[PDB]
């Protein structure tokens, strides 16, 4: 992410959310959480159709 | 129209690169009659060269520019002339390579760069 | 350090440039070639307007150079001819040709 | 008054931004660019039409050869208006178009001039034509030939709504809460959704799995060139071959250099490799030299080329000339088209194969195909330019055909009869109404869904619809990577809001501050760049200076340079001081010693702040101060000092998704000085700041409260369901 | 594995070596194609020690065939670790199968005790070769060297890329 | 390590040849009459696996890259405590995570792995 420095391997820089839903998410971990959710959304949206074909 | 004139080709010739606008302004035919239009000044160390335009010219052009050296030694470049099969005549061998840039001291630089802005805005694609 | 030398800037009139059409003659080599020794005078230069490339052949035919026109040289070069008074006269550049030696 | 900045000032600046630009500015600006500039150039491309009728030699009086010349001039555009069946003409307003099922459009007027040349056809002699008749009605209003009707997008420069005040909008009965940005076709509102495309003029290196002999590929699109490297890693046999257009068999690279004009073998490697010491580079190039050394002749390669053409049995010399012309006509057209630019093409081919071989030596990786900096967005403007070019070409072809037909009968043609003005109008109306982006005959294979009917269910639904982009990949295509969210979407795309189903990830919605570039000329940039100390590519010798920065402009190499740091500082000084418009992008890559300049159209950019080192405070700080914020408040309450005032003073900067690779941004301003858990970032060389993180969200998700306390799919679901609520879609 | 060898790691590693596919290109840290104009003596001191070993250890037939050795060499600097990993003895595996296959490549080889495992692979051809053929030394030998590295199997079974131990 | 040699006449690379009556190696240009005497029996070399130590790559003007991190380690030569540090810029899969430090003043390269 443009806010980091080159060759950074710290956990907070590689997608670690140390906050909670009661506390609140900072922007970067919010972005990483968004990608994590997008993966499962795609999973459902397509593998519905593939499983349908196999079932038929 | 076959032989080459090398009797006066021994003298070294400068290789200077002029800016497009300055070079085009110097292609004027009326000023080609051997008129003294400018002068050069060389530093003692030779690192800084200043081209000063003579006051005989119009005040619409900057009268000061600076020169930078590209290669300290320049080899395998020759200057020739061809006149009326055509008769060719070598002029000399190239000695140094220099490039012209506008001088900051002369305020007219800004003016021409202002004209450069005038060039930038009008044309579109 | 402010000592400088004086070279007046002169030019060549139209009457001389009308019958004197200039062409930049460039030779491709890794060695300092000079026509005093590497060319046996006289030399035969011909074209065998830019469709026919230039051919410069020696009297004995040992030194044959073929020259082609390279276009798009956006740098409009100038020729600084030294006169008897030490002044420099400007000559505009018309065309540039690059020469290569025959195998 | 020299104090730092608080988030309140951030919201002040954002308020100014929306008070200056608007939420639909991109469509309006693309349409204005198209109407003002591109329309003229599309006709000026093909101004001259020529008919050369030779003498039939039937009789002596039929020995005269004729030439007919047709030329075009200016373009004039009227305000929209309609002519009823009675022939009466009255200005058309959107209310009448809506209620009466009309089409909001205007008329186009073009100047036409005609010339006739006649020559005496003497056999064995060149025809010498002379000017005899020239019809040009520029001095009369009859010279303006009516050519067709063009639809107009609402609130654009031509439309009557552009300068209407609130009382003007009420008496004409507008909603003041309407923004424009849509056409009225057949009495229904249409909109064009942005279309995503992969950029051109960029060399890309790919890789292959190895059941096949292929090992690496280098692609460029300008016409396509493929320079492939065949031979597995570690083997003795190395092959590098190029695939030229209209040549099937393909021929090696050393043959290309020989045919191109570089005969000596030693110069080949100076063209390819720019570091003398490296031996692996030359080791991989050895077999190319060995194979290409056998033939020192261009003409064998040209004979190779000549055989593979459709025509067979051609004489050798004609094949030589044909293969010679192929190089300057169709080989890398994006560099140049005219004769005599061979050094540039040779060096560019060397650079391409150098990059391929570098990737082949594991010093770098494959190019990422998902990087959002290598993608352009086509708005209404470019699409209209495409269709207008096609239709104008067909119309002028039809004019030429009819004029030839009437010449065959020796009848004078009326210019007002040869033109079928219905072609342009019918084609444009059909394309905008149906959406099939192509000719009526070939609409089946054309792009679809480009034009959609505006959604007025709720106001936020209209807002979300006028800000939508489509990625034209098969929505049943199983490529997962284009669907997923990518690291380059930060701040330019809303992460929450995306459809569900087959269009998941493929349909994108911009954030509140991701604009798009219009387009600008690269010629002044190149002229200035050569002015300030750039050595041309013709006079470049690798060995004299092997530590030279390369300089690119829109993907064509123009030469090298020696001291780039001061050039970058001066260029950014001029960009920040208004000498160049800030839509131009200028990146420098230190590791590879490269400069890249982009001035094309279709790049998404967002605003950012500027960090400069203040010595009086002893550390870095923003250029913005409390005085500027006070001026902004004064101007906003007075509703001067606007957003462009900030832009031209070097206080903010527009950054695209490519320059972002070489910057550092402090997200909160207080992070620049030396509940939740916020960590102090170790950086101390900051260059920009985030105006506010909230703007990384679109328009749909800007209504959820406390969105960060929610699971992300929940934010997506509400961003979907926010377009089905019932409410006042318009106040009229 | 077998019931007896199941509990011990050593027989397991012997079997693992006996199963995996081993080829020459995998076992040479430098299978370098070098010029070998006169194999009698060299400039490199390291191979000089190996020279006199076999030059005092070659049969009369090898003395006659001295001239058959190619004007180029497959000079094999062989990695110690890779050679010892597959339990590969230098002499037997290096030469028995290789010369038995087609009687194509003879070798001057050292015992494993030298610090640098250097093999000199010199192909063997009849002197009856044609003059045009004999002139094109490099042309035959590069091709046969590639066919040598790629198409010689020292030990193992085909198509099995890797074999791995597990508990 | 075999090096390409170019003919002095037409810059073409020299091909090897043998001299049977003197039994000596020569380099000849197939286009001209130039022949030069070989100085070593080493003409070609084909290594297989590269035992190359990882390199920091281009170093010139690396201190002006503002996306590169910093450290307070002390220079072994000029005794300065400001420098730039980065991982190996060669992109092999199996490269270790060994750092590289470039000093700010003397532009000296060193590593964090001080193996004797």
From Swiss-Prot, chain C:
Q: Which domain of life is it from?
A: Eukaryota
Q: Where in the cell is it found?
A: Nucleus
Q: How is it modified after translation?
A: Phosphorylated on Ser and other residues by TAF1 and casein kinase II-like kinases.
Quaternary structure, per UniProt, is: TFIIF is composed of three different subunits: TFG1/RAP74, TFG2/RAP30 and TAF14.
Any extra remark in the record?
Present with 1920 molecules/cell in log phase SD medium.
Report the protein's function. Answer: TFIIF is a general transcription initiation factor that binds to RNA polymerase II. Its functions include the recruitment of RNA polymerase II to the promoter bound DNA-TBP-TFIIB complex, decreasing the affinity of RNA polymerase II for non-specific DNA, allowing for the subsequent recruitment of TFIIE and TFIIH, and facilitating RNA polymerase II elongation.
What does the sequence similarity comment in the record state about its family? Answer: Belongs to the TFIIF alpha subunit family.
What is the protein's given name? Transcription initiation factor IIF subunit alpha
- Specify the species: Saccharomyces cerevisiae (strain ATCC 204508 / S288c)
State the gene name recorded for this protein.
TFG1
Question: Which residues of the complete protein appear here?
Answer: 95 to 399 of 735
From Swiss-Prot, chain D:
Q: Which domain of life is it from?
A: Eukaryota
What keywords sit in the KW lines?
DNA-directed RNA polymerase, Magnesium, Metal-binding, Nucleotidyltransferase, Nucleus, Phosphoprotein, Transcription, Transferase, Zinc, Zinc-finger
* Bilayer-crossing regions: none
Q: Where is this region: Fork loop 1?
A: 438-449
Q: Which Gene Ontology BP annotations are present? A: RNA-templated transcription; transcription by RNA polymerase II; transcription elongation by RNA polymerase II; transcription initiation at RNA polymerase II promoter
Q: What does this protein do?
A: DNA-dependent RNA polymerase catalyzes the transcription of DNA into RNA using the four ribonucleoside triphosphates as substrates. Second largest component of RNA polymerases II which synthesizes mRNA precursors and many functional non-coding RNAs. Proposed to contribute to the polymerase catalytic activity and forms the polymerase active center together with the largest subunit. Pol II is the central component of the basal RNA polymerase II transcription machinery.
Other information: The binding of ribonucleoside triphosphate to the RNA polymerase II transcribing complex probably involves a two-step mechanism. The initial binding seems to occur at the entry (E) site and involves a magnesium ion coordinated by three conserved aspartate residues of the two largest RNA Pol II subunits.
State whether it acts alone or in a complex, and with which partners, per the record: Component of the RNA polymerase II (Pol II) complex consisting of 12 subunits.
**Protein name per UniProt:** DNA-directed RNA polymerase II subunit RPB2
Query: Corresponding gene?
Result: RPB2
From Swiss-Prot, chain E:
Post-translational note: The tandem 7 residues repeats in the C-terminal domain (CTD) can be highly phosphorylated. The phosphorylation activates Pol II. Phosphorylation occurs mainly at residues 'Ser-2' and 'Ser-5' of the heptapeptide repeat. The phosphorylated form of Pol II appears to carry, on average, one phosphate per repeat. The phosphorylation state is believed to result from the balanced action of site-specific CTD kinases and phosphatases, and a 'CTD code' that specifies the position of Pol II within the transcription cycle has been proposed. Following transcription stress, the elongating form of RNA polymerase II (RNA pol IIo) is polyubiquitinated via 'Lys-63'-linkages on Lys-127 by the RSP5-UBA1-UBC5 complex at DNA damage sites without leading to degradation: ubiquitination promotes RNA pol IIo backtracking to allow access by the transcription-coupled nucleotide excision repair (TC-NER) machinery.
What positions does the cross-link Glycyl lysine isopeptide (Lys-Gly) (interchain with G-Cter in ubiquitin) connect?
A: 127
| Signal sequence region | none
Localization per Swiss-Prot or TrEMBL: Nucleus
- What protein family is recorded? Belongs to the RNA polymerase beta' chain family.
- Protein name (Swiss-Prot/TrEMBL): DNA-directed RNA polymerase II subunit RPB1
Instruction: Give the species this sequence originates from.
Output: Saccharomyces cerevisiae (strain ATCC 204508 / S288c) (Baker's yeast)
Q: Which residues of the full protein are shown?
A: 1120 to 1286 of 1733
UniProtKB/Swiss-Prot annotation, chain F:
Residues annotated as binding Zn(2+) 2 are 75, 78, 103, 106
Q: Name one GO biological process term.
A: transcription elongation by RNA polymerase II
Q: Which UniProt keywords apply?
A: DNA damage, DNA repair, DNA-directed RNA polymerase, Metal-binding, Nucleus, Phosphoprotein, Transcription, Zinc, Zinc-finger
Q: Where in the cell is it found?
A: Nucleus, Nucleolus
Q: Where are the zinc fingers (C4-type)?
A: 7-32
Q: Name one GO cellular component term.
A: nucleus
Please tell me where this protein is predominantly located: nucleus
Q: Which gene encodes it?
A: RPB9
| Record-listed Phosphoserine modification sites | 40
Question: So which domain of life are we looking at?
Answer: Eukaryota
In terms of InterPro entries, this protein maps to: DNA-dir_RNA_pol-M_15_CS, Rpa12/Rpb9/Rpc10/TFS, Zn_ribbon_RPB9, Zn_ribbon_RPB9_C, Znf_TFIIS
Binding residue positions for Zn(2+) 1? 7, 10, 29, 32
Organism annotation: Saccharomyces cerevisiae (strain ATCC 204508 / S288c) (Baker's yeast)
Name recorded for this polypeptide: DNA-directed RNA polymerase II subunit RPB9
Give the Pfam families listed for this entry: Zn_ribbon_RPB9, Zn_ribbon_TFIIS
Q: Which CDD domains match?
A: Zn-ribbon_RPB9
Q: Where are the zinc fingers (TFIIS-type)?
A: 71-111
What is the role of this chain?
Answer: DNA-dependent RNA polymerase catalyzes the transcription of DNA into RNA using the four ribonucleoside triphosphates as substrates. Component of RNA polymerase II which synthesizes mRNA precursors and many functional non-coding RNAs. Pol II is the central component of the basal RNA polymerase II transcription machinery. It is composed of mobile elements that move relative to each other. RPB9 is part of the upper jaw surrounding the central large cleft and thought to grab the incoming DNA template. Involved in the regulation of transcription elongation.
Gene Ontology molecular function, alphabetical:
DNA-directed RNA polymerase activity; nucleic acid binding; zinc ion binding
Q: Which SMART domains match?
A: RPOL9, ZnF_C2C2
> Which family does the similarity line name?
Belongs to the archaeal RpoM/eukaryotic RPA12/RPB9/RPC11 RNA polymerase family.
């Amino acid at each position: 992410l443009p806010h980091f420095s080159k060759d950074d391997y710290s956990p907070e820089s590689k997608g670690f959310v140390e906050n909670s839903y009661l506390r609140g998410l900072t922007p970067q971990e919010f972005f990483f959480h968004a990608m994590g959710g997008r993966e499962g959304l795609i999973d459902t949206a397509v593998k519905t159709a593939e499983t349908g074909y196999i079932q038929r | 129209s076959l032989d080459l004139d090398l009797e006066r080709s021994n003298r070294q010739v400068w290789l200077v690169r002029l800016p497009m606008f300055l070079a085009e302004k110097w292609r004027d035919r009326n000023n080609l009659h051997g008129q003294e239009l400018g002068k050069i000044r060389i530093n003692k160390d030779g690192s800084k060269i200043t081209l000063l335009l003579n006051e005989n010219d119009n005040d619409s052009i900057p009268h000061e520019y600076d020169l930078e050296l590209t290669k300290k030694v320049v080899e395998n470049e020759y200057v020739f002339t061809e006149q009326n099969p055509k008769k060719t005549a070598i002029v000399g061998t190239v000695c140094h390579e220099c490039q012209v840039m506008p001088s900051m001291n002369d305020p007219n630089y800004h003016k021409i760069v202002e004209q450069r802005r005038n060039i930038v805005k009008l044309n579109n694609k | 350090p402010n000592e400088y030398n004086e070279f007046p800037l002169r030019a060549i009139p139209k009457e001389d440039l009308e019958n004197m059409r200039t062409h930049l003659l460039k030779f491709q080599s890794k060695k300092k070639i000079n026509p005093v020794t590497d060319f046996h005078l006289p030399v035969r230069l011909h074209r065998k307007e830019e469709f026919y490339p230039w051919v410069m052949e020696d009297f004995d035919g040992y030194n044959t150079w073929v020259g082609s026109y390279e276009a798009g040289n956006s740098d409009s070069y100038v020729l600084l001819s030294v006169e008897d008074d030490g002044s420099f006269t400007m000559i505009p550049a018309d065309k540039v040709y690059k020469f290569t030696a025959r195998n | 008054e020299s104090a730092p900045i608080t988030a309140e000032d951030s919201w002040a600046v954002i308020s100014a931004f929306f008070r200056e630009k608007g939420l639909v500015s991109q469509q309006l600006d693309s349409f204005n660019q198209f109407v003002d500039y591109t329309l003229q150039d599309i006709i000026c491309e093909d101004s001259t039409l020529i008919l050369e009728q030779l003498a039939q030699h039937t009789t002596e009086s039929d020995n005269i050869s004729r030439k007919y010349e047709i030329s075009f001039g200016k373009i004039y555009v009227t305000k929209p208006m309609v002519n009823e069946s009675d022939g009466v003409t009255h200005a058309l307003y959107p209310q009448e178009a809506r209620l009466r099922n009309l089409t909001y459009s205007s008329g186009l007027f073009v100047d036409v001039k005609k010339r006739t040349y006649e020559a005496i056809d003497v056999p064995g002699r060149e025809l010498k034509y002379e000017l005899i008749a020239e019809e040009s009605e520029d001095d009369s209003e009859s010279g303006k030939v009516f050519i067709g009707r063009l639809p107009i997008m609402l609130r654009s420069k031509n439309c009557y709504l552009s300068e209407a005040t609130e009382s003007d909008l009420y008496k004409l009965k507008e909603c003041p809460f309407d923004m424009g940005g849509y056409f009225i076709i057949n009495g229904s509102e249409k909109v064009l959704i942005a279309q995503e495309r992969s950029a051109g003029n960029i060399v890309q290196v790919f890789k292959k799995a190895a059941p096949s002999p292929i090992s690496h590929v280098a692609e460029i699109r300008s016409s396509t060139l493929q320079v492939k490297l065949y031979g597995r890693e570690g083997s003795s046999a190395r092959t590098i071959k190029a695939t030229l257009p209209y040549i099937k068999q393909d021929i090696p690279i050393v043959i290309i250099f020989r045919a191109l004009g570089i005969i000596p073998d030693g110069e080949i490697l100076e063209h390819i490799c720019y570091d003398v010491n490296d031996w692996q580079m030359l080791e991989m190039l050895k077999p190319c030299v060995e194979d290409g050394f056998v033939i020192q002749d261009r003409e064998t390669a040209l004979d190779f080329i000549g055989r593979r053409g459709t025509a067979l049995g051609i004489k050798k010399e004609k094949r030589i000339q044909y293969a010679k012309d192929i190089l300057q006509k169709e080989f890398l057209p994006h560099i140049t088209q005219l004769e005599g630019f061979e050094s540039r093409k040779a060096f560019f081919l060397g650079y391409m194969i150098n990059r391929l071989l570098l990737c082949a030596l594991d010093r770098k990786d494959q190019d990422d195909r998902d990087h959002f900096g290598k993608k352009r967005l086509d708005l209404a403007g470019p699409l209209l330019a495409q269709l207008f070019k096609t239709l104008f070409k067909k119309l002028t072809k039809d004019i030429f055909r009819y004029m030839q037909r009437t010449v065959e009968e020796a009848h004078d043609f009326n210019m007002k009869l040869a033109i079928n003005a219905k072609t342009i109008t019918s084609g444009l109306k059909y394309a905008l109404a149906t959406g099939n982006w192509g000719e009526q005959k070939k609409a089946m294979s054309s792009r679809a869904g480009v034009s959609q009917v505006l959604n007025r269910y709720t106001y936020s639904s209209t807002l979300s619809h006028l800000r939508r982009t489509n990625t034209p990949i098969g929505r049943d295509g199983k490529l997962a990577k284009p669907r997923q969210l990518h690291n380059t979407h930060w701040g330019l795309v809303c992460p929450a809001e995306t459809p569900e189903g087959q269009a998941c990830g493929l349909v994108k919605n911009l954030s509140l501050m991701s604009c798009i570039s219009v387009g600008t000329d690269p010629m002044p940039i190149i002229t200035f760049l050569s002015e300030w100390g750039m050595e041309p590519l013709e006079d470049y010798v690798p060995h004299q200076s092997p530590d030279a920065t390369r300089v690119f402009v829109n993907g064509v190499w123009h030469g090298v340079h020696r001291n780039p740091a001061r050039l970058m500082e001066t260029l950014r000084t001029l960009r920040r001081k208004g000498d160049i418009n800030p839509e131009v992008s200028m990146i420098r890559d230190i590791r590879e010693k490269e400069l890249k300049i982009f001035t094309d159209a279709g790049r998404v950019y967002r605003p950012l702040f500027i960090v400069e080192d203040d010595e009086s405070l002893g550390h870095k700080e923003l250029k913005v101060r409390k005085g500027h914020i006070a001026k902004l408040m004064a101007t906003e309450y007075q509703d001067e000092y606007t957003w462009s005032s900030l832009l031209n003073e070097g206080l903010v900067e527009y950054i695209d998704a490519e320059e972002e690779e070489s910057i550092l941004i402090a997200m909160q301003p207080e992070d620049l000085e030396p509940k939740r858990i916020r960590v102090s970032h170790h950086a101390t060389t900051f260059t920009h700041c985030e105006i506010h993180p909230s703007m990384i969200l679109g328009v749909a998700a800007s209504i959820i409260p406390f969105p960060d306390h929610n699971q992300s799919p929940r934010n997506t679901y509400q961003s979907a369901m926010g377009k089905q609520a019932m409410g006042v879609f318009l106040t009229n | 594995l077998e019931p007896g060898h199941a509990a011990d790691q050593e027989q397991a590693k012997l079997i693992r070596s006996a199963i995996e596919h081993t080829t020459l290109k995998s076992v040479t840290i430098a299978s370098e194609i070098y010029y070998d104009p006169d194999p009698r003596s060299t400039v490199i001191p390291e191979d000089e020690e190996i020279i006199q070993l076999h030059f005092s250890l070659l049969d009369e037939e090898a003395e006659q065939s001295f001239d058959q050795q190619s004007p180029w060499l497959l000079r094999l600097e062989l990695d110690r670790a890779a050679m010892n990993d597959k339990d590969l003895t230098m002499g037997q595996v290096g030469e028995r199968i290789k010369q038995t296959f087609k009687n194509d490549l003879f070798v001057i080889w050292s015992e494993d005790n030298d610090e640098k495992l250097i093999i000199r692979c010199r192909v063997v051809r009849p002197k009856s070769l044609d003059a045009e053929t004999e002139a094109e030394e490099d042309h035959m030998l590069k091709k046969i060297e590639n066919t040598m590295l790629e198409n010689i199997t020292l030990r193992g079974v085909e198509n099995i890329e890797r074999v791995v131990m597990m508990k | 390590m075999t090096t390409f040699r170019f003919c002095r006449d037409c810059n073409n690379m020299l091909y090897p040849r043998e001299d049977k009556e003197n039994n000596r190696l020569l380099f000849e240009c197939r286009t001209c009459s130039y022949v030069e005497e070989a100085g070593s029996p080493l003409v070609y070399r084909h290594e297989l696996i590269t035992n190359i130590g990882e390199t920091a790559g281009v170093v010139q003007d690396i201190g002006s890259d503002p996306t590169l991190p910093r450290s307070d380690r002390e220079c072994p030569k000029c005794h300065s405590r400001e420098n730039v540090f980065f991982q190996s810029q060669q992109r092999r899969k199996d490269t270790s995570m060994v750092l590289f430090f470039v000093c700010l003043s003397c532009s000296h390269i060193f590593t964090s792995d001080q193996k004797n």
